[PDB]
Amino acid sequence: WTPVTKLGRLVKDGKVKSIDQIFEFGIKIKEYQIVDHLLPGLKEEVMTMQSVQKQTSAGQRTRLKAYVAIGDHNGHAGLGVKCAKEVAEAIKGAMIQAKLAMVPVRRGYWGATIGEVHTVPCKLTGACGSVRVRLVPAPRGTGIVAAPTPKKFLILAGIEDVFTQTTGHTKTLGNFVKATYDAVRQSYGFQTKDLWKVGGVKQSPMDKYAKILAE
C-alpha cells in the first residue's frame, strides 16, 4: 500500500491490468507489492541457505545468504538474493528482491502447434560466472532434464519440457541458479523469424495516464 512511484500508483488504481504491459515497455518495477497485485498466488521455493563470514578483530561475522526463486507457472519467474544475520529475515529480504526481478519467459513448441505451449522456442545459454547453462527444446513427453537446482527454477517458470547441458563449477549453488535465470532472461531478446513483423503502435501507460498521475 501507499504507492510512491507512478507504476505503483497506476497498479493500485487498477489501470495497468497486466504485468505483460510493464514488460512490453521495459518499465522497471521498484515496489514488490506491484507484483503481488498483478500476479496473485505466486508459488515459492527457497533454493539454498549459504552462510558467509567476514573476519574481524574479535572473530568472525556470520551472515545467512538466501537464494529464493519466485514466479507463476505461466511464463513468469524471478530470482533474488539477500544476506542478513537471521534466516527468517534473509528469506523475507530475498522475497522482496525476487519480486522486483521478475522477467518474462518466452516458450514455444517443438515441431507443431498442437496443444499448449510447453518448451523453449530456441537454444538459450546462461552467462553467469564459470557456470554456463544451455537449454534445448524437447518433445512433449520428456520432463525438465536438468540438475535439481535449475530443475526447481525451470518448474516455476512453466517450462515443462527442456534439455540442458551445463558447464563450469556447477557445485556453486548461487551461480547455478543465476545462470538459469540468465538464459531465461534473454528468451524474449533473441529475434526469431516469427518476431520480424513490427506489429502495431501501442501507447505507453505512463504517457496515456500522465495527466491523472500529476493530478
Partner 1 sequence: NKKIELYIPRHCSVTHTLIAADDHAAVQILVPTVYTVKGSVRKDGISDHSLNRQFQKDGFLKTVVPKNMMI
Partner 2 sequence: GRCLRNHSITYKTPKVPYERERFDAELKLVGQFGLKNKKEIQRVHYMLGHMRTIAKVMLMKDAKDPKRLLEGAALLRRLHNLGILPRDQNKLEFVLALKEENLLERRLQTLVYRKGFAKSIHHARVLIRGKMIKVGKQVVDVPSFLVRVESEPLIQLA
Partner 3 sequence: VRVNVLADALKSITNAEKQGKRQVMIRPASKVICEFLNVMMKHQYITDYTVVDTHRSGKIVVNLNGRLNKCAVISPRFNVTLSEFDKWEANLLPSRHFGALVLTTSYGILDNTEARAKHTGGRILGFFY
Partner RNA sequence: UUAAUA
Partner RNA sequence: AUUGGAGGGCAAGUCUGGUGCCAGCAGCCGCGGUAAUUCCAGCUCCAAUAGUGUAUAUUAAAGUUGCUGUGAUUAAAACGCUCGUAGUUGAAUUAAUUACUUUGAAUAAAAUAAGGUGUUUAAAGCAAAACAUUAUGUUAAUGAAUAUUCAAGCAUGGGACAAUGC
Partner RNA sequence: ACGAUCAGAUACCGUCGUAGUCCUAACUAUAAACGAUGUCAACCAAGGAUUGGAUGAAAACCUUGUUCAGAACUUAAAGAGAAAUCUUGAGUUUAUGGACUUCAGGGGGAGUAUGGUCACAAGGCUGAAACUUAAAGGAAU
Q: Which residues sit at the interface with partner 2, rule CB under 8 A? A: 111-112, 114-115, 139-141, 148
Contact pattern from residue 55 through residue 94 relative to partner 3, giving x for each residue in contact according to CB under 8 A and a dash for the rest: ----------------------------------------
Name the E strands within 151-208. 162-167
Q: Which of partner 1, partner 2, RNA, none is residue 125 near (CB under 5 to 8 Å by kind)?
A: RNA
Shortest approach of partner 2 to residue 139 CB, angstroms? 5
Q: Which is nearer to RNA, 21 or 149 (CB)?
A: 149
How far, in Å, CA of 130 to CA of 159, rounded? 24
Question: Long-range pairs for 88-96 at CB < 8 Å and ≥24 separation?
Answer: 90/49, 90/63, 90/64, 90/65, 90/66, 91/46, 91/66, 93/66, 94/66, 94/67, 94/68, 95/32, 95/44, 95/68, 95/70, 96/32
Q: Which residues bind partner 1 (CB under 8 A)?
A: 20-21, 23-26, 28, 75, 103-106, 108-109, 113, 116-117, 185-186, 188-191, 195, 198-199, 201, 204, 207
User: Angle at Cα 91 formed by Cα 165 and Cα 50, nearest 5°?
Assistant: 55
Shortest approach of partner 1 to residue 196 CB, angstroms? 9
Task: Point out which residues bind partner 3 (CB under 8 A).
Answer: 108, 110-111, 121-123, 137, 190-193, 196
